[PDB]
Amino acid sequence: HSHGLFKKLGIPGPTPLPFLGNILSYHKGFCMFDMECHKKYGKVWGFYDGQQPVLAITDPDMIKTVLVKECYSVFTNRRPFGPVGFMKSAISIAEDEEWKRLRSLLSPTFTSGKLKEMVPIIAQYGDVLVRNLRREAETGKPVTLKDVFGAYSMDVITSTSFGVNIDSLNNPQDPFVENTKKLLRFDFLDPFFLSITVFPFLIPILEVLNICVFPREVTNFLRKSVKRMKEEDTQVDFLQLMIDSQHKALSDLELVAQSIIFIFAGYETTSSVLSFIMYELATHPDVQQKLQEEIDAVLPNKAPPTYDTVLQMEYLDMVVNETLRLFPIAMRLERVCKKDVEINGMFIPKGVVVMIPSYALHRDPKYWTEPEKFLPERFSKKNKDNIDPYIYTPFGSGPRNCIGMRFALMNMKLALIRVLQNFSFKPCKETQIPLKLSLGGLLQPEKPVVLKVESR
Ligand code: HEM
Ligand SMILES: CC(C)C[C@H]1C(=O)N2CCC[C@H]2[C@]2(O)O[C@](NC(=O)[C@@H]3C=C4c5cccc6[nH]c(Br)c(c56)C[C@H]4N(C)C3)(C(C)C)C(=O)N12
């Protein structure tokens, strides 16, 4: 859509350039762009990703209408996305009735009931993380978190996806490990994705040549793996649960598409959040101590964490939430406007991408006292009442929110519990303070986080 849409509707925004739109304003990443646009333009603004119009919204009533009230009718889909091949069937990429059907099929799979049955499996790799952690501390030397937390994230991934039990950090040559590893989140400011934003007319050329953004080698490998783990003796993983739910039914290709997208959805995200959490805990030693005291109180002398004990830990839950306030690694939620609507007094035309800038709202002075400050007390039970759930959106909201939210929390918390029970984390002189964010399209630190690990 032409660069004249937002002026035509009287909506403010950075003036776009011919062809590029506003992409040159991303030279400091999505988060800084979004903060700046918010401070200079107000409650609503418009900008262009190449030819594509994007309208940013910040009013919580309007946000609710997009994410919740008009999800099925008008705002069903994420922005159209590069060449995807058979991954068009992955729930996160799927559209309209195909989406509604896969969400309906995959919902039972993410119950709390199922998640409880998955707990022992997840906990088991907590112990593997601890054992590993022990050694790279007993050594001495600063620890790289993305590495220790990367391996942990994959270990839970493999075993919870289909019972491939592997010590990922001490088997960095296992082909299953070295293939899954390649399912990292897309940096949409990298040269390929920039090019595709400015030349989106080239995507169908890429689809016909089978050039896919999920590398062919990796998805080939997994499709082949899943087929063979499927075919027999029968004596609790995502595959099994999907196998069983096979308009309804779940077809074969669709099944593998989900198995891949759970990896990609879960892998770099969990690991990234875990590293942020540790960063904050190390730079706030009092918060770290307080967390360890709550853990020792609930699980006396290092008792194994359980579904129920995890859920009782209030301060743990507060620490996790406040980290996700500061580092909401999705950055933004988006929905395509399927048809002209008028929402809370404002006309949004067909085809616009409506964007909710979580990162900016999470640090908004209007909603948050000293926004740049890590303060878990924000979430204390008698203080969290004034947290608006359309301003704080780390897992998004509505029918299309994170389907893996309770799983991701449970996973992250089971890790933190086992780590904190055994260790304390302290900054090195090599630790970057204060933390600086990457200028690329992912929310992550500029340099990796390294910290000293010490047995308690
Ligand atoms: C680790 C921390 C995680 C965070 C912060 C996170 C955040 C998000 C966000 C912001 C969305 C977009 C929702 C929206 O548009 O409103 C999303 C969607 C999604 N998440 Fe997560 N996520 C995490 C982990 C996971 C995990 C472990 C899984 C494993 C299955 C997962 C599966 C998905 C899927 C499939 C979607 C798309 C759902 C749909 O389109 O219907 N996520 N997540
Ligand atoms: C790409 C899909 C398949 C992954 C899906 C998902 O499964 N997720 C799991 C956890 C996080 C979430 C996801 O990566 O995070 C999501 N974010 C995105 O993928 C957003 C989509 C973008 C995009 C797609 C296509 C062309 C583009 N040009 C430009 Br400029 C951008 C862009 C910005 C980019 N933003 C900032 C992120 C949601 C928070 C909206 C998302 O859609 N994800």
mmCIF file of C-alpha atoms in Angstrom, residues 114-454:
data_model
loop_
_atom_site.group_PDB
_atom_site.id
_atom_site.type_symbol
_atom_site.label_atom_id
_atom_site.label_comp_id
_atom_site.label_asym_id
_atom_site.label_seq_id
_atom_site.Cartn_x
_atom_site.Cartn_y
_atom_site.Cartn_z
ATOM 1 C CA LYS A 114 -0.660 -32.691 30.364
ATOM 2 C CA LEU A 115 1.921 -30.258 31.649
ATOM 3 C CA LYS A 116 1.880 -31.959 35.055
ATOM 4 C CA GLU A 117 2.596 -35.296 33.331
ATOM 5 C CA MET A 118 5.543 -33.558 31.555
ATOM 6 C CA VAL A 119 7.010 -32.151 34.796
ATOM 7 C CA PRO A 120 9.175 -35.153 35.844
ATOM 8 C CA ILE A 121 10.736 -35.247 32.362
ATOM 9 C CA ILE A 122 11.556 -31.484 32.509
ATOM 10 C CA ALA A 123 12.832 -31.753 36.089
ATOM 11 C CA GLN A 124 15.213 -34.581 35.089
ATOM 12 C CA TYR A 125 17.171 -32.184 32.834
ATOM 13 C CA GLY A 126 17.273 -29.580 35.587
ATOM 14 C CA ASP A 127 19.556 -32.085 37.369
ATOM 15 C CA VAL A 128 21.624 -32.400 34.152
ATOM 16 C CA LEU A 129 21.948 -28.583 34.029
ATOM 17 C CA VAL A 130 23.083 -28.571 37.725
ATOM 18 C CA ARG A 131 25.632 -31.363 37.183
ATOM 19 C CA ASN A 132 26.947 -29.486 34.147
ATOM 20 C CA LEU A 133 26.844 -26.146 35.972
ATOM 21 C CA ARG A 134 28.807 -27.632 38.850
ATOM 22 C CA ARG A 135 31.767 -28.428 36.571
ATOM 23 C CA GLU A 136 32.089 -25.116 34.720
ATOM 24 C CA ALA A 137 32.145 -23.466 38.174
ATOM 25 C CA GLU A 138 34.306 -25.992 40.014
ATOM 26 C CA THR A 139 36.708 -25.167 37.196
ATOM 27 C CA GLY A 140 36.297 -21.477 37.830
ATOM 28 C CA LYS A 141 36.129 -19.065 34.890
ATOM 29 C CA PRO A 142 33.069 -16.936 33.948
ATOM 30 C CA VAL A 143 30.113 -18.875 32.504
ATOM 31 C CA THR A 144 28.308 -17.962 29.266
ATOM 32 C CA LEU A 145 24.594 -18.155 30.018
ATOM 33 C CA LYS A 146 23.174 -18.525 26.486
ATOM 34 C CA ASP A 147 25.339 -21.674 26.258
ATOM 35 C CA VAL A 148 24.362 -23.364 29.521
ATOM 36 C CA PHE A 149 20.781 -22.180 29.149
ATOM 37 C CA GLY A 150 20.751 -23.068 25.381
ATOM 38 C CA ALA A 151 21.637 -26.695 26.099
ATOM 39 C CA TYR A 152 19.013 -26.862 28.878
ATOM 40 C CA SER A 153 16.288 -25.483 26.591
ATOM 41 C CA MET A 154 17.034 -28.127 23.896
ATOM 42 C CA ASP A 155 17.219 -30.973 26.408
ATOM 43 C CA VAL A 156 13.649 -30.178 27.538
ATOM 44 C CA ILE A 157 12.656 -29.657 23.941
ATOM 45 C CA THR A 158 13.861 -33.044 22.669
ATOM 46 C CA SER A 159 12.484 -35.151 25.552
ATOM 47 C CA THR A 160 9.121 -33.338 25.771
ATOM 48 C CA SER A 161 8.748 -33.341 21.926
ATOM 49 C CA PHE A 162 9.440 -37.141 21.501
ATOM 50 C CA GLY A 163 11.556 -38.739 24.230
ATOM 51 C CA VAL A 164 14.955 -38.165 22.655
ATOM 52 C CA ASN A 165 16.915 -38.114 25.913
ATOM 53 C CA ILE A 166 20.256 -36.363 25.317
ATOM 54 C CA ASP A 167 22.859 -34.331 27.234
ATOM 55 C CA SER A 168 23.042 -31.619 24.527
ATOM 56 C CA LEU A 169 26.035 -29.766 25.980
ATOM 57 C CA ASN A 170 28.144 -32.959 26.232
ATOM 58 C CA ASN A 171 26.931 -34.288 22.859
ATOM 59 C CA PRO A 172 27.421 -31.260 20.571
ATOM 60 C CA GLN A 173 27.992 -33.757 17.700
ATOM 61 C CA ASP A 174 24.707 -35.742 17.954
ATOM 62 C CA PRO A 175 23.088 -34.936 14.566
ATOM 63 C CA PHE A 176 19.668 -34.404 16.286
ATOM 64 C CA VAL A 177 21.299 -31.835 18.568
ATOM 65 C CA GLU A 178 23.193 -30.155 15.706
ATOM 66 C CA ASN A 179 20.051 -30.005 13.543
ATOM 67 C CA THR A 180 17.589 -28.686 16.241
ATOM 68 C CA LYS A 181 20.240 -26.082 17.208
ATOM 69 C CA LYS A 182 19.704 -24.444 13.779
ATOM 70 C CA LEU A 183 16.086 -23.542 14.622
ATOM 71 C CA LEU A 184 16.922 -20.114 16.013
ATOM 72 C CA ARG A 185 14.516 -17.205 15.764
ATOM 73 C CA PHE A 186 14.653 -15.035 12.654
ATOM 74 C CA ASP A 187 16.528 -11.755 12.822
ATOM 75 C CA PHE A 188 14.229 -9.687 10.660
ATOM 76 C CA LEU A 189 16.810 -6.934 10.316
ATOM 77 C CA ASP A 190 19.384 -9.205 8.731
ATOM 78 C CA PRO A 191 20.207 -8.660 5.029
ATOM 79 C CA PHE A 192 17.941 -11.420 3.719
ATOM 80 C CA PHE A 193 14.862 -10.277 5.654
ATOM 81 C CA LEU A 194 15.520 -6.574 4.926
ATOM 82 C CA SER A 195 15.751 -7.461 1.250
ATOM 83 C CA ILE A 196 12.494 -9.376 1.453
ATOM 84 C CA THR A 197 10.754 -6.454 3.187
ATOM 85 C CA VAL A 198 11.836 -4.130 0.297
ATOM 86 C CA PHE A 199 11.264 -6.778 -2.420
ATOM 87 C CA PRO A 200 8.237 -8.773 -1.068
ATOM 88 C CA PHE A 201 7.167 -9.333 -4.646
ATOM 89 C CA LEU A 202 10.090 -11.812 -4.787
ATOM 90 C CA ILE A 203 8.625 -14.276 -2.264
ATOM 91 C CA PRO A 204 6.616 -16.212 -4.787
ATOM 92 C CA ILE A 205 9.794 -16.698 -6.878
ATOM 93 C CA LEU A 206 11.391 -18.121 -3.763
ATOM 94 C CA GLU A 207 8.380 -20.418 -2.975
ATOM 95 C CA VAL A 208 8.513 -21.910 -6.519
ATOM 96 C CA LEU A 209 12.286 -22.566 -6.229
ATOM 97 C CA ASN A 210 11.735 -24.217 -2.829
ATOM 98 C CA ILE A 211 13.973 -21.723 -1.062
ATOM 99 C CA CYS A 212 12.559 -21.655 2.480
ATOM 100 C CA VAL A 213 13.469 -19.540 5.553
ATOM 101 C CA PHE A 214 13.513 -22.747 7.608
ATOM 102 C CA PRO A 215 16.696 -24.347 6.229
ATOM 103 C CA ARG A 216 15.835 -27.361 4.048
ATOM 104 C CA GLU A 217 18.539 -29.574 5.631
ATOM 105 C CA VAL A 218 17.066 -29.220 9.110
ATOM 106 C CA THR A 219 13.407 -29.725 8.207
ATOM 107 C CA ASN A 220 14.326 -32.663 5.940
ATOM 108 C CA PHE A 221 16.138 -34.276 8.837
ATOM 109 C CA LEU A 222 13.219 -33.779 11.257
ATOM 110 C CA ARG A 223 10.459 -34.924 8.891
ATOM 111 C CA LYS A 224 12.501 -38.110 8.359
ATOM 112 C CA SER A 225 13.084 -38.526 12.107
ATOM 113 C CA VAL A 226 9.398 -38.065 13.008
ATOM 114 C CA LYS A 227 8.276 -40.626 10.377
ATOM 115 C CA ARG A 228 10.622 -43.255 11.878
ATOM 116 C CA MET A 229 9.833 -42.510 15.537
ATOM 117 C CA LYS A 230 6.168 -42.897 14.519
ATOM 118 C CA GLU A 231 6.423 -46.465 13.093
ATOM 119 C CA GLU A 232 5.750 -50.081 17.079
ATOM 120 C CA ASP A 233 5.095 -51.721 20.436
ATOM 121 C CA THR A 234 3.406 -49.137 22.752
ATOM 122 C CA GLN A 235 4.495 -49.494 26.417
ATOM 123 C CA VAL A 236 3.899 -38.654 27.144
ATOM 124 C CA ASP A 237 5.484 -36.167 24.734
ATOM 125 C CA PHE A 238 4.028 -33.634 22.238
ATOM 126 C CA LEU A 239 4.347 -36.070 19.289
ATOM 127 C CA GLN A 240 2.425 -38.789 21.125
ATOM 128 C CA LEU A 241 -0.288 -36.356 22.117
ATOM 129 C CA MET A 242 -0.484 -35.139 18.505
ATOM 130 C CA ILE A 243 -0.353 -38.743 17.186
ATOM 131 C CA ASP A 244 -3.441 -39.450 19.237
ATOM 132 C CA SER A 245 -5.520 -36.489 18.033
ATOM 133 C CA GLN A 246 -5.104 -37.894 14.488
ATOM 134 C CA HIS A 247 -13.815 -30.654 10.431
ATOM 135 C CA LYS A 248 -11.201 -32.164 12.789
ATOM 136 C CA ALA A 249 -8.215 -34.633 12.689
ATOM 137 C CA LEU A 250 -4.545 -33.662 12.389
ATOM 138 C CA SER A 251 -2.828 -34.748 9.126
ATOM 139 C CA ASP A 252 0.768 -36.041 8.754
ATOM 140 C CA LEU A 253 2.457 -32.924 7.330
ATOM 141 C CA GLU A 254 0.587 -30.670 9.729
ATOM 142 C CA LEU A 255 1.910 -32.873 12.566
ATOM 143 C CA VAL A 256 5.586 -32.421 11.647
ATOM 144 C CA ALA A 257 4.971 -28.689 11.000
ATOM 145 C CA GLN A 258 3.832 -28.281 14.620
ATOM 146 C CA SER A 259 6.760 -30.345 15.967
ATOM 147 C CA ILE A 260 9.209 -28.049 14.160
ATOM 148 C CA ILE A 261 7.472 -24.800 15.222
ATOM 149 C CA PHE A 262 7.399 -25.830 18.901
ATOM 150 C CA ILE A 263 11.193 -26.064 18.704
ATOM 151 C CA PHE A 264 11.638 -22.744 16.959
ATOM 152 C CA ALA A 265 8.994 -21.179 19.275
ATOM 153 C CA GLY A 266 10.472 -22.612 22.417
ATOM 154 C CA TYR A 267 14.234 -22.861 21.895
ATOM 155 C CA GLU A 268 15.880 -19.396 21.711
ATOM 156 C CA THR A 269 13.020 -17.880 23.714
ATOM 157 C CA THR A 270 13.331 -19.886 26.946
ATOM 158 C CA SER A 271 17.133 -19.695 26.807
ATOM 159 C CA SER A 272 17.004 -15.954 26.205
ATOM 160 C CA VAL A 273 14.562 -15.297 29.091
ATOM 161 C CA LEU A 274 16.641 -17.521 31.421
ATOM 162 C CA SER A 275 19.770 -15.474 30.683
ATOM 163 C CA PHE A 276 17.988 -12.206 31.248
ATOM 164 C CA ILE A 277 16.601 -13.560 34.593
ATOM 165 C CA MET A 278 20.098 -14.578 35.758
ATOM 166 C CA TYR A 279 21.561 -11.281 34.583
ATOM 167 C CA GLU A 280 19.046 -9.435 36.794
ATOM 168 C CA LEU A 281 19.521 -11.749 39.779
ATOM 169 C CA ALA A 282 23.301 -11.342 39.676
ATOM 170 C CA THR A 283 23.112 -7.499 39.460
ATOM 171 C CA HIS A 284 20.513 -7.495 42.289
ATOM 172 C CA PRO A 285 22.138 -9.839 44.847
ATOM 173 C CA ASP A 286 19.407 -9.055 47.443
ATOM 174 C CA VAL A 287 16.710 -10.252 45.064
ATOM 175 C CA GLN A 288 18.785 -13.365 44.423
ATOM 176 C CA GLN A 289 19.149 -14.064 48.154
ATOM 177 C CA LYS A 290 15.443 -13.458 48.761
ATOM 178 C CA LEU A 291 14.574 -15.937 45.977
ATOM 179 C CA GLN A 292 16.884 -18.563 47.415
ATOM 180 C CA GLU A 293 15.309 -18.108 50.837
ATOM 181 C CA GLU A 294 11.819 -18.643 49.369
ATOM 182 C CA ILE A 295 13.060 -21.765 47.579
ATOM 183 C CA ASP A 296 14.774 -23.212 50.690
ATOM 184 C CA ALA A 297 11.594 -22.461 52.683
ATOM 185 C CA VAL A 298 9.292 -24.307 50.227
ATOM 186 C CA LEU A 299 11.709 -27.094 49.348
ATOM 187 C CA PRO A 300 13.705 -27.707 52.574
ATOM 188 C CA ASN A 301 17.214 -29.140 52.103
ATOM 189 C CA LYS A 302 17.163 -29.170 48.306
ATOM 190 C CA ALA A 303 13.981 -31.219 47.815
ATOM 191 C CA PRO A 304 12.960 -31.830 44.140
ATOM 192 C CA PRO A 305 10.553 -29.182 42.729
ATOM 193 C CA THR A 306 7.023 -30.319 41.844
ATOM 194 C CA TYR A 307 4.177 -28.927 39.734
ATOM 195 C CA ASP A 308 2.523 -27.795 43.009
ATOM 196 C CA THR A 309 5.617 -26.397 44.776
ATOM 197 C CA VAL A 310 6.605 -24.368 41.721
ATOM 198 C CA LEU A 311 3.189 -22.765 41.650
ATOM 199 C CA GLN A 312 3.346 -21.747 45.334
ATOM 200 C CA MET A 313 6.497 -19.652 44.893
ATOM 201 C CA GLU A 314 5.173 -16.101 44.768
ATOM 202 C CA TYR A 315 8.512 -14.242 44.626
ATOM 203 C CA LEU A 316 9.830 -16.595 41.927
ATOM 204 C CA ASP A 317 6.724 -15.780 39.902
ATOM 205 C CA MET A 318 7.361 -12.006 40.598
ATOM 206 C CA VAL A 319 11.020 -12.237 39.406
ATOM 207 C CA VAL A 320 10.069 -14.040 36.187
ATOM 208 C CA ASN A 321 7.332 -11.490 35.477
ATOM 209 C CA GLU A 322 9.466 -8.409 36.083
ATOM 210 C CA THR A 323 12.185 -9.790 33.814
ATOM 211 C CA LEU A 324 9.612 -10.320 31.082
ATOM 212 C CA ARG A 325 8.455 -6.731 31.649
ATOM 213 C CA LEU A 326 11.969 -5.450 30.962
ATOM 214 C CA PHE A 327 12.816 -8.040 28.266
ATOM 215 C CA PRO A 328 9.649 -9.047 26.362
ATOM 216 C CA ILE A 329 11.512 -10.870 23.653
ATOM 217 C CA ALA A 330 8.580 -10.926 21.199
ATOM 218 C CA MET A 331 9.022 -7.070 21.209
ATOM 219 C CA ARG A 332 5.711 -6.515 19.392
ATOM 220 C CA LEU A 333 2.424 -8.246 18.679
ATOM 221 C CA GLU A 334 0.938 -7.884 15.211
ATOM 222 C CA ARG A 335 -2.398 -8.589 13.510
ATOM 223 C CA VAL A 336 -3.444 -7.964 9.913
ATOM 224 C CA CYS A 337 -6.642 -5.956 9.483
ATOM 225 C CA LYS A 338 -8.827 -8.295 7.359
ATOM 226 C CA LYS A 339 -11.427 -5.597 6.566
ATOM 227 C CA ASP A 340 -12.164 -1.919 7.144
ATOM 228 C CA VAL A 341 -13.243 -1.474 10.750
ATOM 229 C CA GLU A 342 -13.897 1.304 13.158
ATOM 230 C CA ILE A 343 -12.446 0.511 16.560
ATOM 231 C CA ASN A 344 -12.941 2.760 19.610
ATOM 232 C CA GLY A 345 -13.439 5.781 17.296
ATOM 233 C CA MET A 346 -10.693 5.093 14.742
ATOM 234 C CA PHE A 347 -10.961 3.812 11.151
ATOM 235 C CA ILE A 348 -8.455 1.082 10.177
ATOM 236 C CA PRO A 349 -8.470 0.120 6.508
ATOM 237 C CA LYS A 350 -8.080 -3.368 5.041
ATOM 238 C CA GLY A 351 -4.566 -4.821 4.847
ATOM 239 C CA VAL A 352 -2.913 -2.614 7.458
ATOM 240 C CA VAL A 353 -0.761 -4.421 10.018
ATOM 241 C CA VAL A 354 -1.969 -3.382 13.510
ATOM 242 C CA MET A 355 0.971 -3.479 15.865
ATOM 243 C CA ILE A 356 0.990 -3.443 19.677
ATOM 244 C CA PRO A 357 4.392 -2.336 20.808
ATOM 245 C CA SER A 358 4.875 -4.432 24.005
ATOM 246 C CA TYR A 359 8.427 -3.378 24.602
ATOM 247 C CA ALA A 360 7.419 0.326 24.613
ATOM 248 C CA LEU A 361 4.309 -0.164 26.729
ATOM 249 C CA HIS A 362 6.323 -2.178 29.286
ATOM 250 C CA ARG A 363 8.560 0.861 29.803
ATOM 251 C CA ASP A 364 5.874 3.546 29.602
ATOM 252 C CA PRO A 365 6.103 6.255 32.364
ATOM 253 C CA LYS A 366 2.288 6.559 32.349
ATOM 254 C CA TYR A 367 1.865 2.943 33.478
ATOM 255 C CA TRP A 368 5.082 2.130 35.327
ATOM 256 C CA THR A 369 6.918 3.847 38.162
ATOM 257 C CA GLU A 370 10.643 4.180 37.314
ATOM 258 C CA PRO A 371 10.167 1.958 34.178
ATOM 259 C CA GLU A 372 13.864 1.317 33.506
ATOM 260 C CA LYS A 373 14.229 -0.231 36.979
ATOM 261 C CA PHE A 374 14.174 -3.975 37.827
ATOM 262 C CA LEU A 375 11.712 -4.163 40.765
ATOM 263 C CA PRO A 376 9.886 -7.457 41.346
ATOM 264 C CA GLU A 377 7.670 -5.821 43.989
ATOM 265 C CA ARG A 378 5.727 -4.494 40.982
ATOM 266 C CA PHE A 379 4.125 -7.940 40.892
ATOM 267 C CA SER A 380 3.594 -8.533 44.665
ATOM 268 C CA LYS A 381 0.089 -9.864 45.227
ATOM 269 C CA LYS A 382 -1.114 -6.664 46.823
ATOM 270 C CA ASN A 383 0.357 -4.283 44.243
ATOM 271 C CA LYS A 384 -0.195 -6.122 40.922
ATOM 272 C CA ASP A 385 -3.859 -5.048 40.768
ATOM 273 C CA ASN A 386 -2.996 -1.952 38.800
ATOM 274 C CA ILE A 387 -1.151 -3.921 36.121
ATOM 275 C CA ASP A 388 -3.219 -3.551 32.936
ATOM 276 C CA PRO A 389 -3.214 -6.929 31.039
ATOM 277 C CA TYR A 390 -3.250 -5.154 27.649
ATOM 278 C CA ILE A 391 -0.177 -3.066 28.602
ATOM 279 C CA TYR A 392 1.730 -6.037 30.050
ATOM 280 C CA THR A 393 1.678 -8.561 27.206
ATOM 281 C CA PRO A 394 4.866 -10.715 27.243
ATOM 282 C CA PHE A 395 2.878 -13.712 25.920
ATOM 283 C CA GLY A 396 0.425 -11.542 23.990
ATOM 284 C CA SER A 397 -3.297 -11.951 24.608
ATOM 285 C CA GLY A 398 -6.553 -13.333 23.283
ATOM 286 C CA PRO A 399 -7.304 -16.516 21.303
ATOM 287 C CA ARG A 400 -4.004 -16.187 19.417
ATOM 288 C CA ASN A 401 -1.704 -15.657 22.443
ATOM 289 C CA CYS A 402 1.235 -17.943 23.351
ATOM 290 C CA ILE A 403 -0.202 -21.526 23.383
ATOM 291 C CA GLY A 404 2.950 -22.589 25.207
ATOM 292 C CA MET A 405 2.801 -19.975 28.008
ATOM 293 C CA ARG A 406 2.130 -22.234 31.041
ATOM 294 C CA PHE A 407 4.702 -24.707 29.677
ATOM 295 C CA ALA A 408 7.341 -21.996 29.201
ATOM 296 C CA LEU A 409 6.767 -20.626 32.755
ATOM 297 C CA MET A 410 6.880 -24.088 34.311
ATOM 298 C CA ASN A 411 10.079 -24.909 32.339
ATOM 299 C CA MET A 412 11.871 -21.679 33.202
ATOM 300 C CA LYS A 413 10.816 -21.953 36.888
ATOM 301 C CA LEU A 414 11.885 -25.619 37.306
ATOM 302 C CA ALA A 415 15.311 -24.589 35.946
ATOM 303 C CA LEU A 416 15.696 -21.508 38.180
ATOM 304 C CA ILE A 417 14.662 -23.536 41.227
ATOM 305 C CA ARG A 418 17.277 -26.278 40.663
ATOM 306 C CA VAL A 419 19.943 -23.729 39.732
ATOM 307 C CA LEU A 420 19.316 -21.491 42.767
ATOM 308 C CA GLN A 421 19.090 -24.400 45.196
ATOM 309 C CA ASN A 422 22.713 -25.289 44.318
ATOM 310 C CA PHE A 423 24.375 -22.066 43.129
ATOM 311 C CA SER A 424 24.829 -18.346 43.454
ATOM 312 C CA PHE A 425 25.499 -16.101 40.467
ATOM 313 C CA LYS A 426 27.732 -13.081 40.586
ATOM 314 C CA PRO A 427 29.051 -10.608 38.021
ATOM 315 C CA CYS A 428 32.622 -10.709 36.629
ATOM 316 C CA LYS A 429 34.578 -7.638 35.548
ATOM 317 C CA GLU A 430 33.751 -9.061 32.102
ATOM 318 C CA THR A 431 29.997 -8.637 32.752
ATOM 319 C CA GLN A 432 28.574 -5.662 30.823
ATOM 320 C CA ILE A 433 26.944 -3.121 33.239
ATOM 321 C CA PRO A 434 24.473 -1.656 32.725
ATOM 322 C CA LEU A 435 23.192 -4.075 30.092
ATOM 323 C CA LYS A 436 23.149 -2.952 26.446
ATOM 324 C CA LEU A 437 20.683 -4.316 23.873
ATOM 325 C CA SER A 438 21.552 -5.632 20.426
ATOM 326 C CA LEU A 439 20.862 -3.235 17.517
ATOM 327 C CA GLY A 440 19.645 -6.189 15.402
ATOM 328 C CA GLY A 441 16.063 -7.412 15.127
ATOM 329 C CA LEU A 442 16.183 -9.670 18.212
ATOM 330 C CA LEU A 443 15.749 -8.605 21.843
ATOM 331 C CA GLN A 444 18.973 -9.851 23.369
ATOM 332 C CA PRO A 445 22.099 -8.364 24.906
ATOM 333 C CA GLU A 446 24.742 -6.702 22.659
ATOM 334 C CA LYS A 447 27.494 -8.998 24.036
ATOM 335 C CA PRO A 448 26.578 -12.340 25.664
ATOM 336 C CA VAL A 449 25.980 -12.476 29.415
ATOM 337 C CA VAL A 450 28.804 -14.090 31.369
ATOM 338 C CA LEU A 451 28.610 -14.658 35.110
ATOM 339 C CA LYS A 452 30.500 -16.347 37.937
ATOM 340 C CA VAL A 453 28.797 -19.475 39.300
ATOM 341 C CA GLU A 454 29.511 -20.571 42.880
#
